[PDB]
Design a protein around this ligand. Structure first.
Ligand SMILES: [Zn+2]
Ligand SMILES: [Zn+2]
Lengths: 99, 99
């Protein structure tokens, strides 16, 4: 559980740094909110849901299904964007990385 | 030029929809600003730089080098995130897409 939780937390961290929108049903409230991470003073990152009125709830390590579902959707969106980059370089002749 | 410009504009559109942060040196000002797209009333999407005080400048079709450079950086960031998803699924056993 802790492994799976930290890998999810690590992805959410990376995506949040990029600006990537993520939303999920909170395991605690039932309410929709934004998926984020919090870092304890000791350097451990855990997952939370921030509900649009400010309320934030910790995601239990045994219940990350809704977070994994959203990470799945994000993964597909990023795959699609990269497929288009590949198309525009290989079929379109665009050299995005001038080299 | 128009082809290359529209493919870049199409990527910027997709990334902006995802929330992905993009910044570049404006071909007109010299100033740094955020890369975005604008859509004419007739449905054509062109590229602009929005400078943090509100000033927005059209990017000429013959001068998209700084936009392509940033799209290159974004591409590498997204490749890195997907490499980590692949690692966490294949080596970490995490099934992000429950199926
Ligand atoms: Zn909640
Ligand atoms: Zn400018």
């Amino acid at each position: 559980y802790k492994q799976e939780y930290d890998m999810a937390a690590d992805l959410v961290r990376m995506l949040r740094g990029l600006g990537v929108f993520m939303h999920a049903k909170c395991p605690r409230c039932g309410a929709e909110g934004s998926v984020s991470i919090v870092e304890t003073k000791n350097g451990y990152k855990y997952l939370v849901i921030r509900h649009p009125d400010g309320g934030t709830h910790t995601v239990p390590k045994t219940d990350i299904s809704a977070i994994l579902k959203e990470l799945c959707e994000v993964k597909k969106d990023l795959e699609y964007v990269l497929k288009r980059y590949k198309e525009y370089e290989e079929e379109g002749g665009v050299k995005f990385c001038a080299e």
